[PDB]
């Protein structure tokens, strides 16, 4: 029932695409487990990251891009819809100008496109989570 973590999969994203992840943190929120989702330009994990989504469970969320191997301007959110010791459903939707991030069905974070989502070739899900579901869906 569990998927390998780090989870790496080739992907093709555009407006209307949704990346759905179902998982659970591997530690209590007091221990600050992390969750990291990276939308890469290539299959190599050292490649540029169009959209980096990093949850520090119980503390904050950081979003950024890595371009020409360098981390850019970080965006921080204190919104924490994720609940201690619970399974979560995270979905990342590709809108024309931004990603819209839902947590358990509730709109929780946004990130304006810095590089077109069509540059994405690979998605990596990793850090302190167990994973049961990774789905790419599309609605025109």
């Amino acid at each position, epitope marked *: 029932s569990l998927l390998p973590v780090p989870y790496t999969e080739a992907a093709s994203l555009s407006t209307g695409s949704t990346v759905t992840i179902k998982g659970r943190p591997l530690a209590c929120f007091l221990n600050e487990p992390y969750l990291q989702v990276d939308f890469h*330009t290539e299959m190599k994990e050292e*490649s540029d990251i169009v959209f980096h989504f990093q949850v520090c469970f119980g503390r904050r969320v950081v979003m950024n891009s890595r371009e020409y191997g*360098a981390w850019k301007q970080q965006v921080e959110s204190k919104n924490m819809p994720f609940q201690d010791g619970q399974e979560f459903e995270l979905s990342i939707s590709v809108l024309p*100008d931004k990603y819209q991030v839902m947590v358990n069905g509730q709109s929780s974070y946004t990130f304006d496109h*810095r*590089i*077109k989502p069509e*540059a994405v070739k690979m998605v990596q899900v990793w850090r302190d989570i167990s994973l049961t579901k990774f789905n790419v869906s599309y609605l025109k």
Partner: antibody, heavy 121, light 111 residues
Framework: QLQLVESGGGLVQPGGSLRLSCAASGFTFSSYAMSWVRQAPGKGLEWVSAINSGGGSTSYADSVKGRFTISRDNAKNTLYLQMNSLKPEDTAVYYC??????????????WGQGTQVTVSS | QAGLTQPPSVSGTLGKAVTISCAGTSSDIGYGNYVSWYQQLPGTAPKLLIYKVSRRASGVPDRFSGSKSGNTASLSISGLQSEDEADYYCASYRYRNNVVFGGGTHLTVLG
């Protein structure tokens, strides 16, 4: 540290040829599109030519089409501009720049120091 | 063919704000979100300030802002500093012509 270094500039007679080089370092050159952008004395910027990451797709400004050839050597991390049948209107500082393609909204994030080209008798 | 048209010269006052216009066509500025703004000092390479009409480049403070309305783009600069006295160029993708540029604007910072 990311660096772009143009070379090959100099004085050329009208109708003559010149090959410019741009040496890339501090980044994975083969992953990015590249462009040449020039600036004539006392004038603004003008895009010259563009090439994709692999080198299979190229494009040229109407003013240089049929006279210039953009190419790249990904094993040597070098971008080239072969310039033939040169004219005084080609006199400019030539810059190599990146990415400049559609997926990056055509922006130029990084530039070289530029190389001077003078077409004169 | 009408090109990206900017005012050759604009003036703003130290600590205050200024706008720089760039008039284009429905093939370039009015075609998509492909507007970029560059700062330049003569003898050096241009430096990106804005991309995708309104996004700031690396280390560019929020006092630099970009927008567009129809076929015209604008660069707004608030809290004017001595460093801002320089040249500015707008750029846009143009249908079948890759990147087109404005003729440039020299900004004077008065006071």
């Amino acid at each position: 540290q990311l660096q772009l270094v143009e070379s090959g500039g100099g004085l050329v007679q009208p109708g003559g040829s010149l090959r410019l080089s741009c040496a890339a370092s501090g980044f994975t050159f083969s992953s990015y599109a590249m462009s040449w952008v020039r600036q004539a004395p006392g004038k603004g910027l003008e895009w010259v030519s563009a090439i994709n990451s692999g080198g299979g797709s190229t494009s040229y400004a109407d003013s240089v089409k049929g006279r210039f050839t953009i190419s790249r050597d990904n094993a040597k991390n070098t971008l080239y501009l072969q310039m033939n049948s040169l004219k005084p209107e080609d006199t400019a500082v030539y810059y190599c720049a990146t990415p400049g393609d559609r997926l990056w909204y055509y922006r130029y994030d990084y530039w070289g120091q530029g190389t001077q080209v003078t077409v004169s008798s | 063919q009408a090109g990206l048209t900017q005012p050759p010269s604009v003036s703003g006052t130290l600590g205050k704000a200024v706008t720089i216009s760039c008039a284009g066509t429905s093939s370039d500025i009015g075609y998509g979100n492909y507007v970029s703004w560059y700062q330049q000092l003569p003898g050096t390479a241009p430096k990106l300030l804005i991309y995708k009409v309104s996004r700031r480049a690396s280390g560019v403070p929020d006092r630099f802002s970009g927008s567009k309305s129809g076929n015209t783009a604008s660069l707004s600069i608030s809290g004017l500093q001595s460093e801002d006295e320089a040249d500015y160029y707008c750029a846009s993708y143009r249908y079948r012509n890759n990147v087109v540029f404005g003729g440039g604007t020299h900004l004077t910072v008065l006071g």
